[PDB]
Design a protein around this ligand. Structure first.
Ligand code: HEM
Ligand code: DMU
Ligand code: CA
Ligand code: CL
Ligand code: CL
Ligand code: CL
Ligand code: CL
Ligand code: NA
Ligand code: NA
Length: 611
C-alpha cells in the first residue's frame, strides 16, 4: 500500500492536482526526508505542503457572510480594534471575534479529566534536570515569543468558576493541592458548520497591539498626544499605574522580559515619529501616530519572520523559506530595488498586489494557540551580568548574582525590573540560553502561579499552569496528538517508540496513558516528539506554522495592497526596508552594550555565539 492507511480516505477524495502534491510530500514523509535534502527540494516540499494545508486546513467559525460595507481608501491605517482591514469583511481579525479552526473539533467533554491534568503536569511536564538550547536561542527569544503570543491571542473567559483537585497519587508532589479558574466562554455560531466557538479578545492582525493597546481607555492613556508619541519612563522602562500595572498594550500574565521589549518598541515607535516628522514637518499627532504604527508593526512582523523564526528553525532550508516569504525567492536585492516581481513565490507574500485569504475569513485559530504553548522556554534562574564589568574567563560580561525568575514575574516582577534597569536585564537575557521544549522542563513557578485579570491585576486563585494547559486543549475540543497529526496529513505514531527514543519518556508515558496512542495529549506529544536537527519545535507544531505564519502576512492589506510609500511614507518604508532583525532595533537605542557585548549576528542567539 502506497499511501498510509489513515490517509487513504482523504487521498481518494482529492482532486487530481491535490493527489499529485500529496504524493510528492508523502514520498518524503514516509522516509522522514524533507529536512534531509538540499534547499531547493526542501522549499518545493514546503510550498506543496502549504498549498494542501491552505485548501484542507482553514475552517470558518461563525457566519462568513459579514456584510458591513466600507471603502478601503477611507481606512489607510491600522485601526485600534482591528476592524476595516479586509475590504470584503470589516470584522475579520478584529477583537472579540471567533477563533477559526485548522481542523474539525473533537468533542472531549466526557474525557476532560482523563488522564488527570495534575498527573500529566507532575509526571511528564514538571522540570527535573534543566534543559536549554545551547547557543541557539536566548532569553530575549523566549521573551519575544510571549511578547508576540500573549498579544496575538487571549480566549474570552466565562464569568463563573470551576475547580480541580490533585488526586491522592500526586498531591504530595503538587505545589497546589487544588485550583480554581474560569472556563473558556462558549458562544453559539448560529451557522451551518461548527456550532460552538470561542472568542479572541485581541486583534489577530500584525498590528503591534502589545505596544498600542487592546482597549479604549489605555490605548488613549498610552499616548503623549504630541508628535504621535507614546509614554515611556526616564530610565527607558515602562511607566506604571498606581496599582502597579505597566502602562503598555495590556499584556496580562507578563514578566520583566516582555516588559523590556515593550519598552524597546515604545522607543522604536517614538524614533519612527521623529524620522517621519523630519520628512513631513506639518503632520498632526494623529497622522504621525498612524504612520509610525504602520512602520513599527511591520518592523515587528519582519523581525519575527526573518530573524526570530530563522533562529528557532536553525536550518538552511528554513532560512531560505522564511526569507522567501518576506522578500521572495528572487531575494532582497531585487525586492528592494525593483519591488514585488511575479507571484507569492518569486516576489514574496509581502508586497503582493492584493491580500489573499484563500476563501476563508482571516482569524487566528484554536490550533495556533495550542502549538504556541511554549512555557518550558522560561529558565528557572537568571544570571544577572555587569554591562561595564571586566570580561570574565569566558569573555562574557561577569556574573553579579543569580535571581529566581519567579521573582521577575507579574506585578512583583515589574518592581524588581525597576531596580535592575534595561541594559542589565537585556544583556543578562542575551547571554543566557532559554529552556528547551522537551518533557520534564516546565518551571516550578508556573505550578503555583498568580494569574491576572484583563486589567492586569492579580487574581486570588493561583493556578497550576501546566495542569491547566492540558485541560484547555481538551476543553476547547482540539484533537489530541495523534489525530492532530492525521489532520495535517502527517503520519501518526503506532507506538510510543515512534514518538521518541527516550526510554524514560516511553515508560512514563506508558504508566499514564497505557498503550493507547489516541489518548496522548497534544501538549505532551509536542514536547516529547523527536526533533529535526536545528529545530527548537516539533514537526507537528511546525505544520501549523507553515500555514498560519504565511497567512498572517498574505491576508493583511497593509503587508500587500497597501505595503507602499503612499501608505507608510517614504521615510517610513525605508525604516522597514533597512531593519533586518532585533539586533538593528537594540543597536538603534542601545549601541553601547551592542558594540561591547553582542557578538552573534542575531540578537536572538546567545550573544557570544560564533555566527
Ligand atoms: C513568565 C512568563 C509567562 C507567564 C507568567 C505566562 C502565563 C500564562 C497564563 C496565566 C496564561 C493563561 C492560562 C489560562 O487561563 O488558560 C497563559 C496563556 C498562554 N501562554 Fe503564557 N506565560 C508566560 C510565557 C509564555 C511564553 C514564553 C509563551 C510562548 C509563546 C506563552 C504562550 C501562551 C499561550 C499560547 C497561551 C494560551 C493563550 C490562549 O488561551 O488564548 N506564554 N500564559
Ligand atoms: C494538465 C491537464 C489537467 C488534466 C485534468 C485534471 C482534472 C482532474 C481534476 C479533478 O480531479 C478529480 O477530482 C475529483 C474530486 O473533485 C475526484 O473525485 C474524488 O473525490 C470526490 C469528492 O471529493 C468524490 O465524489 C469522487 O467520487 C472521487 O473520485 C477525482 O477522483 C479526481 O480525478
Ligand atoms: Ca494584534
Ligand atoms: Cl533574501
Ligand atoms: Cl510566484
Ligand atoms: Cl509564527
Ligand atoms: Cl522590507
Ligand atoms: Na518516528
Ligand atoms: Na554577520
Amino acid at each position: 500500500g502506497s499511501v498510509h492507511p489513515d490517509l487513504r480516505d482523504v487521498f481518494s477524495k482529492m482532486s487530481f492536482f491535490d493527489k499529485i502534491g500529496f504524493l510528492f510530500i508523502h514520498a518524503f514523509d514516509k522516509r522522514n526526508l524533507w529536512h534531509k535534502v538540499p534547499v531547493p527540494i526542501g522549499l518545493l516540499y514546503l510550498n506543496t505542503r502549504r498549498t494542501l494545508l491552505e485548501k484542507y486546513n482553514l475552517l470558518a467559525v461563525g457566519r462568513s457572510s459579514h456584510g458591513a460595507l466600507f471603502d478601503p481608501k477611507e481606512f489607510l491605517y491600522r485601526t485600534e480594534d482591528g476592524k476595516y482591514n479586509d475590504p470584503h469583511n470589516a470584522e475579520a481579525g478584529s477583537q472579540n471575534t471567533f477563533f477559526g479552526r485548522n481542523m474539525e473539533p473533537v468533542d472531549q467533554q466526557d474525557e476532560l479529566m482523563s488522564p488527570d491534568p495534575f498527573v500529566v503536569a507532575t509526571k511528564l511536564l514538571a522540570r527535573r534536570e534543566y534543559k536549554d538550547t545551547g547557543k541557539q536561542f536566548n532569553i530575549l527569544a523566549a521573551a519575544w515569543i510571549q511578547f508576540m503570543v500573549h498579544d496575538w491571542m487571549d480566549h474570552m473567559e466565562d464569568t463563573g468558576q470551576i475547580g480541580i483537585t490533585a488526586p491522592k497519587e500526586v498531591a504530595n508532589e503538587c505545589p497546589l493541592k487544588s485550583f480554581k479558574f474560569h472556563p473558556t466562554k462558549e458562544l453559539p455560531t448560529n451557522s451551518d458548520g461548527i456550532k460552538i466557538g470561542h472568542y479572541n479578545i485581541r486583534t489577530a492582525w500584525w498590528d503591534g497591539s502589545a505596544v498600542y493597546g487592546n482597549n479604549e481607555e489605555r490605548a488613549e492613556k498610552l499616548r503623549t498626544y504630541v508628535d504621535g508619541k507614546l509614554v515611556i519612563g526616564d530610565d527607558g522602562l515602562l511607566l506604571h499605574k498606581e496599582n502597579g500595572v505597566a502602562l503598555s498594550g495590556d499584556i496580562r500574565n507578563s514578566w520583566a522580559g516582555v516588559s523590556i521589549l515593550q519598552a524597546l518598541f515604545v522607543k522604536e515607535h517614538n524614533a519612527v515619529c521623529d524620522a517621519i516628522k523630519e520628512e513631513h514637518p506639518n503632520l498632526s499627532d494623529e497622522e504621525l501616530y498612524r504612520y509610525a504604527k504602520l512602520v513599527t508593526s511591520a518592523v515587528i512582523a519582519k523581525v519575527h519572520t526573518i530573524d526570530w523564526t530563522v533562529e528557532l528553525l536553525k536550518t538552511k532550508t528554513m532560512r531560505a523559506a522564511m526569507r522567501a516569504n518576506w522578500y521572495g525567492l528572487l531575494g532582497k536585492k531585487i525586492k528592494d530595488t525593483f519591488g514585488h516581481i511575479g507571484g507569492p513565490i518569486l516576489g514574496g507574500l509581502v508586497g503582493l498586489k492584493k491580500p489573499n485569504n484563500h476563501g476563508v475569513p482571516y482569524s487566528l485559530t484554536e490550533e495556533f494557540t495550542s502549538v504556541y504553548r511554549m512555557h518550558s522556554l522560561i529558565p528557572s534562574t537568571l544570571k544577572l551580568r555587569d554591562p561595564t564589568g571586566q570580561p570574565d574567563a569566558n569573555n562574557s560580561p561577569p556574573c553579579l548574582e543569580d535571581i529566581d525568575i519567579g521573582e521577575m514575574i507579574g506585578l512583583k516582577g515589574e518592581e524588581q525590573l525597576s531596580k535592575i534597569g534595561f541594559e542589565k536585564q537585556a544583556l543578562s537575557m542575551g547571554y543566557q540560553a532559554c529552556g528547551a521544549l522537551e518533557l520534564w522542563n516546565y518551571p516550578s513557578f508556573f505550578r503555583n502561579l498568580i494569574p491576572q485579570n484583563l486589567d492586569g491585576t492579580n487574581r486570588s486563585d493561583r493556578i497550576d499552569l501546566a495542569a491547566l494547559e492540558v485541560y484547555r486543549d481538551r476543553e476547547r475540543s482540539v484533537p489530541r496528538y495523534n489525530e492532530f497529526r492525521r489532520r495535517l496529513f502527517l503520519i501518526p505514531i503506532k507506538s510510543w517508540e515512534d514518538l521518541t527514543s527516550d526510554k524514560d519518556a516511553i515508560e512514563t508515558i506508558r504508566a499514564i496513558y497505557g498503550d493507547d496512542v489516541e489518548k496522548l495529549d497534544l501538549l505532551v506529544g509536542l514536547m516529547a516528539e523527536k526533533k529535526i536537527k536545528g529545530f527548537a519545535i516539533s514537526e507537528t507544531a511546525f505544520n501549523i506554522f507553515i500555514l498560519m505564519a504565511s497567512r498572517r502576512l498574505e491576508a493583511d492589506r497593509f503587508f500587500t495592497s497597501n505595503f507602499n510609500e503612499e501608505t507608510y511614507t517614504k521615510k517610513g518604508m525605508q525604516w522597514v526596508k533597512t531593519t533586518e532583525g532585533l539586533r538593528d532595533v537594540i543597536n538603534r537605542h542601545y549601541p553601547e552594550i551592542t558594540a561591547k557585548w553582542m557578538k552573534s549576528s542575531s540578537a536572538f542567539s546567545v550573544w557570544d555565539a560564533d555566527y
